[PDB]
Amino acid sequence: GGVMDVNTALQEVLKTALIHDGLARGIREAAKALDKRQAHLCVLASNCDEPMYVKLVEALCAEHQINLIKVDDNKKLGEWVGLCKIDREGKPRKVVGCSCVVVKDYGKESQAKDVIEEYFKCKK
């Protein structure tokens, strides 16, 4: 899809893993997912909530399979999932963030979308 950024990687991963039904949005669905053996990617953002969850997500991914890719601006990845699909990007109806998203087995069967991990396994 994109030019293999630290950001366009999610931009091609999302718009795609929703059809896999992978995007366990919110923090609670995320925790419920990665507490099991399903998680294959995690995200975060700034601390618009209690400062004790940025401890917990880092700690839980660390326990079994850490893959945290911290990309700030919660509202950005929020705009990348919305509720579902689109109305506008200038959408005053429902545009809020996610602050964490957990993909399952890197989504539907795919080609260049895998290259995110082909890049960021070794540099980290």
Binding site: A31, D35, M52, K55, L56, E58, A59, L60, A62
Partner: protein
């Protein structure tokens, strides 16, 4: 088929007590988790859902008709 008269108590429904979202885990250190309430050993349950800390009771909200531990 006649009109209704003023009642004595009428009130519709409870208000879904607004507890904080998720504080079921605590860290001794980053990447050394502790769990206050035990995860329910159920087959239908995916072993990722928690139990109520209901001392004199243990209540799993998924199996909403059975599997309660009394201590």
């Amino acid at each position: 088929k006649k009109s209704y008269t003023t009642p004595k108590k009428n009130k519709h429904k409870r208000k879904k007590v607004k507890l904080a979202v998720l504080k079921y885990y605590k860290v001794d250190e980053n990447g050394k988790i502790s769990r206050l309430r035990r995860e329910c050993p159920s087959d239908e349950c995916g072993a990722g859902v928690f139990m109520a800390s209901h001392f004199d009771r243990h209540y799993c909200g998924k199996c909403c008709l059975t599997y309660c531990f009394n201590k």
